[model samples]
Target chain A: NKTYKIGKNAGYDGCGLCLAAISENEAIKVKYLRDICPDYDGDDKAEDWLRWGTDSRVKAAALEMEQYAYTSVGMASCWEFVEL
Target chain B: GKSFKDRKMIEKMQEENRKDREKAAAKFREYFPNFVGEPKSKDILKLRLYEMQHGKCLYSGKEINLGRLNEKGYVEIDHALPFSRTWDDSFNNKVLVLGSENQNKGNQTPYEYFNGKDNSREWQEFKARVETSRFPRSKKQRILLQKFDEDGF
Candidate 1:
C-alpha cells in the first residue's frame, strides 16, 4: 500500500505540508501505477520512479530526475533523466 | 536428418570471425540512434529474434523454457546454413533456438516438420479444423489464428 507519509519528513524528507493536500491525488496515482506496472519493482515508494525517490524503492531506479505535475497552476521540472 | 529436426541436431554457426559479441551489442545502439537513454551493450538483434519467436526452438516448434542469457539454460542463434560454406547473414538463415537443440540439429530442412503425407494424424486434425464451419470460413473472418505454424505464417 502507498503511505501518505504525512509526517514532518513526508513530502521529500519530513516536509509533511507538501503531501497534506496531495494525499488523495497521490493515492489515485498509486492505484493507476500499480495497475499498469503490477510487477513494477519500484511500485510502493512514490519517489522510486518519481525521479526523487530512494534507490531501494526502484529495481534499477531511473538515473535522472525531474519534477513535474504540481498544483501551482502547473508543475515543475525538478529533476531530469540523465540519458546516455 | 530425422523427421523431428530440432535445434539439438544443428551446430552453432561461427560468429567470432565477424565481430565480438560485445561489438555486436554496441552495433544495436548504432542502428537505433534515437535510443540514447541507457547504454545497453547487448546483442539487440538476437534479442529481437528471440522476441519474435517467443523463445521457441525454431525447428521443432517447441517452447524454450529458459529466458536468461549466459546461463546453463540459455538460448542462441544458429545459421541454418553454416557460415563455413556460406557467409551471408541473411534473415532467412538466422533462427533462435535453445543452445542444446541448436547443437543437435547441425542443419535440417522442412522435412523435419512436415511428414509429407497430408492425411497424417497432425494433418488430419488440421483438416478437421479447416473443414469445420467454425473455422476461418475461407478468409471471410478470423475464427482462430495461430502464428508460426509449420505451414508458415
Candidate 2:
C-alpha cells in the first residue's frame, strides 16, 4: 500500500528533502506535526523531524529513517503526504 | 537536493551529545552548588505559557484542565506555522494547545485555519488573545500570520 504519511530524515535539511519528495507531476501538500515540545529544533533531520508519521521516500531514505528517525516521543522529524 | 550521505554520523553525535550534556550539567551544578535550587526548565515553558494564556487552549479558546485522565486533557506545544510550510521549528514558531484542538486546527497556517468564510469576528478575537497575551512578538506573528508568500518559497 502506498503511504500518505512521510517520515523525517535525520541529519538532512527538511525543506530540501520535501522539495525532493514532491513529484514534478503532482503538488504534494506537506504538513508539520500539530503537537510538539517547545524544545524541539525545527528542520527536516534526525534530531528534529518534519511532519507526518514515518518515512516514505526513496527506499534508501525511507527505510533508514523509519528505524533511526521516527519516534512516538521526544523531538524528531515527521511529515504528511497530502497527495500522490 | 544533495541529501545526507551519512546519517550514521548523527547517531554517534546523538549519543556523545547526550553524555556530554549530562557531564556539562553536573559541572555547572557543582559551580552553583551553594546557590538556591535550580529552575526546572521543562516545567517553566509550559507552566508560564499556561498561566499567561490563563489556562486556555490557544487554538480554540477552550479551557485546559491541566490534567489528562480521559475525562479531559491539558495543553501541548504546537506550531503556529506548519513546519512543512515554513521549516521553522523554533519555540518562537510554537504555541500551546489541547491535543484535540491542535489536531482540528493543525494542518494549516494560523490565518488559513482561523480565517475563512465571514471570519472577521473570530479572527479579531484570536488576534486580541495574541495581543493581550504575553506571547513574544515572533510567536504572535506566527499565530497571526496572514499568508505565506509562495514567492518566498
Candidate 3:
C-alpha cells in the first residue's frame, strides 16, 4: 500500500471540504453536460430552467442576472474606477 | 564769430521750443478732441489769446517772439498750474501768451506766486488766465459721475 494523509472530512468551513462520490452514470451525465453546456449550474433539473423546452423560464432569470452584470462593478474597492 | 554762434544757439533753442510746443498742442487736441470745441472756436481763441498778450511775454511783458508771434511762435497756452497738479481741464485755462510766463509759473499755486504786478500782467495778457486760476480742478473738469456711488465718472 502507498503512504497517505487524512484530515477531518468536514463541509467547507476551510480545512478539508467534503465530496460525495457520484455513480458512474451520474459522472457520465455530468461529463456530457459539461461538454455541451460549460456553465451549467447543476440546477438545470428544474422544468422552468430547462434550456430547450418551450416551458423553460431560464432566460427571464438569466436576463435579470445579465442586467446585474451590466450594473454591478463586482466587489469594487475604489470610487475612482466608477463608470458613467 | 562768438556772437554769431550765440545767435545760432538761440535760434536752435527757439526752434526746439517751438517744436515741443506744437507737439504739446497737437497732443492736447488728440487727448481732448473737444477742448476747443470747433475749428472756428480754436482759430478765434488762438487769435484772441495772442492779440491779448500783445505778442509779448505774459509775465514780463517783454516781446519774446519779437516777430508776428503767430501760432508757431514762442508764446503758448500754459495750464497756469499744470494739468498734472489739477483737474482744471478747461479751454478758459488756455491763453495766448509768452513762453516765459508758463516757465515762471510752473506748478506753483496762483496764491503762492500771487504778485499783484505779475497777476495783473497775466490778466492783461490773457483775461481768461486769472479766471481759470480762480477755481479748483475738480469743479472745472466734467466727470460723468453720480453723488452716491460716483459710478458714472
Candidate 4:
C-alpha cells in the first residue's frame, strides 16, 4: 500500500530493477514488500533482470506482504499480526 | 501488622489511596513514554495490582515500598511469560514484583519457579486474587489481554 521511485540509472541490478519495475507496474500490489525485494543473485544485465521478473519466489514474497501487516523499523521487522 | 492481606481492608485502603495512585501513574506516564501499555492504562494496572497484592511482591508476597530510599529491594515489572520467549509487552503478560525476585526469576516462566507451590492454599488464594482482581478495566486493555492470551505466550 505504498510506492517508491527508483531512478533510471541508480546502479541497481536485476533484483533492484525488478523491485523498481514491480513498483512502476501495477501487476504486483502488496503491503509489506513495497520497499523490500528478494536477495540479489548477482545478475546485473537486462536479460538477467527478466529472470527475476518472473521468479515465483519473488512473486510470492510480494504477495505475502499483502497478507501480513509489516512495518520496517530501523534494523527490525515488526509483524503486526499473523494470517491465522 | 500493616499487611494488606484482608480483602475488605485492601478495598477500603484503595478507595482512600486512589488519588495518590493516579498521581503516581501520571508521573510515570510522563516520564516513560516508551514504556509498554498506554500510560494511563499501565498506571491503572499498577495501582490495582499493587493494591490487590497489598503492595506486596507478586511472587514472594512480601511488602514492597518502592519509594523508600534505603530499601534493599525496589519494585519491578515482571513478565509472566518471559518476554524473550513471547516478545509480548502487554499488561496481561506483566505483574508487579519485587526487584530481587524478578532477578531470581530472570526470564524463567512463572511456572518454572512457582509451579510446585501451586497446590498450597495460600498459592491458590493468591492465584484467585490475581485472576479476579486483574481483569482489564478498559476496552483497549481488554483487547490487549485478549491478544496476549490468544498469542499463547
Q: Specify the poorest-scoring 10-residue window by lDDT in model 3 chain B.
A: B141-150
Residue ranges of candidate 2 with Cα displaced over 4 Å: A1-84, B1-43, B67-74, B116-119, B151-153
lDDT of 2 at B7: 70
Best by lDDT: 2
TM-score of candidate 2 versus the correct structure, residues matched by position: 0.49
Candidate 1 wrongly placed segments (more than 4 Å) = A1-84, B1-42, B83-88, B112-153
- lDDT per residue for candidate 1 within B116-151, as digits (tens), equals 244356434433432432212432122112222332
Q: Evaluate residue B14 in candidate 1 and report its C-alpha lDDT on the 0 to 100 scale.
A: 40
Each prediction's Cα lDDT score?
A: 0.33, 0.49, 0.34, 0.42
TM-score of chain B of 2: 0.62
Q: TM-scores for chain B, in order?
A: 0.41, 0.62, 0.40, 0.49
The better-scoring model by lDDT among 1 and 2 is 2
Off by over 4 Å in 3: A1-84, B1-44, B64-66, B71-73, B115-153
As for TM-score, the candidate ahead, 1 or 2, is 2
- Angstrom error of the Cα, residue B25, model 2: value is 13
Best by TM-score: 2
Task: Give the TM-score between model 3's chain B and the true chain B.
Answer: 0.40
